[PDB]
């Protein structure tokens, strides 16, 4: 059921943005262990005085890397005779961000028909507006609104080339790395409580419903904004990882980035590469029985070398009744165990592919819990 | 001359440590981009609920990288229970360094024959003092003292591996990168008035004295560890650059770490081949008037193909009266134009080699002024 109920018009993500203490750094490890373009900067040298800002790109992704100059420099400014790109931005903020969160998303981006509506309707309809509707060079108009924790749903309409005051990199500085990620399917929060955050962000926006956890997702009118939510079970087991994030990340916070692939294999066959060498780790390779058991329920998808290939890099599968996602984590981006990313590629649901198509791994927690017991042998 | 007046015995240069706000990131940055290896760690992992901390390597070159968790994690610690591996962090003095800093070097650690007296003698002449002789493991004695700014000069002394807590790293995660670096040459200090910082450096120390600026260099006995000294010299044609330093650094602090490479031509092609993709990036070459001047002055030192290796890479060469020196300097490593990186090979004075050989590059000055003028032609 899709009740199509989004009370403004949501187009899809448009960007992300990390808050960061050196945007420079994480935006260097980020390109190299994920294959994004250099695209646009706003610092120093495009006379931004109060951020530095990166923007990596691949496909449609669109990662920002923010961090806050001294804020001597801007001393003498006031908003109106800003000089930052991102007239939300406030070294406070960041600095207080980064301090409570270490590197982590402090924007989850969507564009939208018309930011200035979607931000009053927002607030008319429950949301505690984070940054009013402002209008960049009568081009762009972005408003932020709380999301969770201290994470905001950014809001940018183009009456129409990233933002204004960015600009394009110097092509020598821009190499064109590209390991087949082509966008971002959806974003997870971490809440302590899933009831309030879901009735919250579902009550602003009109996005509808589409082991450890409890969670939900969240999802616009053709649902192509995905945004999961995830609470703990206490008691369990197995201590609850979602505890674990907010324990590290100080409370609730966006838990990890889904990059769709156009082609999954070369994407974790080249970020592998780089595992050890500037890129990022992923999680351990389930055990051989997850691979045994592979053929009998998705061997009417993949012949046994892409099944192969799978046991090789680490791959996960699964299969809802409209599609099969094939889907791998990473092991946490920065030091604390709190945010990571998944890789991920969708078959099926072909009209175009309809979002969601697959589900998000909901079978891979029985899958894994019983290859695990049936590998002791 | 050389009074060898050293107040305690000093044998080298031991490790510089980075204050990060994440240190996954930067550290993985700059093992990409300089080919320093992971050796050891200090984190969750190890048992460490304070600060993780990631060693990189390369021949005797330590980088230190350490970034804070949250104070949540260990609020039930007091010093003599805590469960941080380096004793004098501390949450509210790392967090103040990087917001006020940015990404910067902490500590400047030297070895010592015995870090507890060259602390007593330190503070007895002088010295400020920043943290108290402590001994870890019975095995490792640590001390700090002020050096200028937010920076402290580290003394290390052992009886008898990095550091007790710290662990050697999975060799799976541990990839052999090496791009020639072999050890620190010398650490550069801006500050904005020389005499008082030398004066107090060499005062408690017993250091000997081995455009825009005006610098001096202290030296311990053996002249193996050099701390050069920057000041601004204002009023000039084009801005100072250690005024720049000082603007956007919120002060004194670490300017640059030169780093010495057994094969200053293979670190340039990797590092350069790298720049794009992850690592650092290099000042802008000198026009080709620098290297046709070149073979008057060095020629009777370089081939002219080793010269024309120079200008592929941007290679600076100067000569002083007892050695040749061959330098290269990085764009900042950071957001701010603060601490950036040199690149040294010396060649001459062997006796192995003496420290200083070949001077700091004073000669460049005047013939990369002369070397612009003369291409403009
Ligand atoms: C597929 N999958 C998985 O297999 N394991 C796993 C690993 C190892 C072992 Cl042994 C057992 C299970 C996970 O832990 C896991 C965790 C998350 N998560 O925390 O969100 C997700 C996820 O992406 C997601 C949700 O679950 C619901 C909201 C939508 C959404 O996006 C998927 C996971
Ligand atoms: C070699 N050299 C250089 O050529 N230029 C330069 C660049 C471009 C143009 Cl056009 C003209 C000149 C520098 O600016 C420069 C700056 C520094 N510094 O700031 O310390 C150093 C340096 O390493 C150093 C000192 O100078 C004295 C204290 C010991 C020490 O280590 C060397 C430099
Ligand atoms: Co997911
Ligand atoms: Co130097």
């Not at 012949?303 to 409209?322: A, F």
């Amino acid at each position: 059921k899709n009740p199509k109920s989004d009370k403004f018009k949501v187009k899809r993500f448009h960007h992300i943005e990390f808050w960061c203490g050196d945007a420079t750094n994480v935006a260097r490890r980020f390109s190299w262990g994920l294959g994004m373009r250099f695209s646009a900067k706003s610092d120093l040298s495009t006379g931004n005085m109060v951020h530095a800002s990166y923007l990596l790109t691949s496909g449609d992704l669109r990662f920002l890397f923010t961090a806050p100059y001294s804020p001597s420099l801007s001393a003498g400014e006031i908003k109106p005779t800003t000089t930052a790109s991102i007239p939300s931005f406030d070294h406070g903020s960041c600095r207080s961000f980064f301090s409570s969160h270490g590197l982590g998303v402090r924007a989850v981006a969507i564009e939208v028909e018309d930011a200035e509506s979607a931000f009053s309707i927002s607030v008319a309809n429950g949301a505690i507006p984070s940054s009013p509707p402002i209008v960049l060079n009568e081009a762009v108009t972005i408003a932020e609104v709380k999301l969770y924790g201290d994470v905001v749903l950014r809001y940018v309409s183009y009456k129409a080339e990233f933002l204004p005051g960015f600009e394009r990199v110097e092509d020598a500085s821009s190499f064109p790395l590209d390991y087949g990620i082509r966008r971002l399917d959806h974003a997870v929060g971490n809440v302590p409580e899933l009831g309030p955050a879901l009735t919250y962000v579902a009550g602003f926006t009109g996005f509808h419903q589409f082991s450890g956890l409890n969670s939900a997702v969240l999802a616009s009118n053709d649902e192509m904004v995905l945004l999961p939510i995830n609470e703990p079970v206490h008691g369990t087991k197995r201590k609850s990882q979602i505890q674990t994030y907010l324990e590290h990340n100080e409370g609730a916070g966006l838990q990890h980035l889904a990059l769709m692939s156009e082609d999954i294999f070369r994407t974790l066959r080249e970020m592998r590469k780089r595992s050890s060498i500037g890129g990022f780790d992923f999680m351990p390779s389930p055990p051989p029985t997850y691979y045994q058991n592979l053929k009998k329920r998705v061997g009417d998808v993949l012949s046994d070398d892409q099944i192969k290939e799978c046991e090789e890099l680490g791959i996960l599968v699964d299969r809802d009744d409209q599609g099969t996602l094939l889907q791998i984590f990473t092991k946490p981006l920065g030091d604390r165990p709190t945010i990571f990313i998944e890789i991920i590629q969708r078959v099926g649901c072909m009209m175009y592919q309809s979002g969601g198509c697959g589900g998000f791994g909901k079978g891979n927690f029985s899958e894994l819990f019983k290859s695990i017991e049936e590998y002791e042998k």
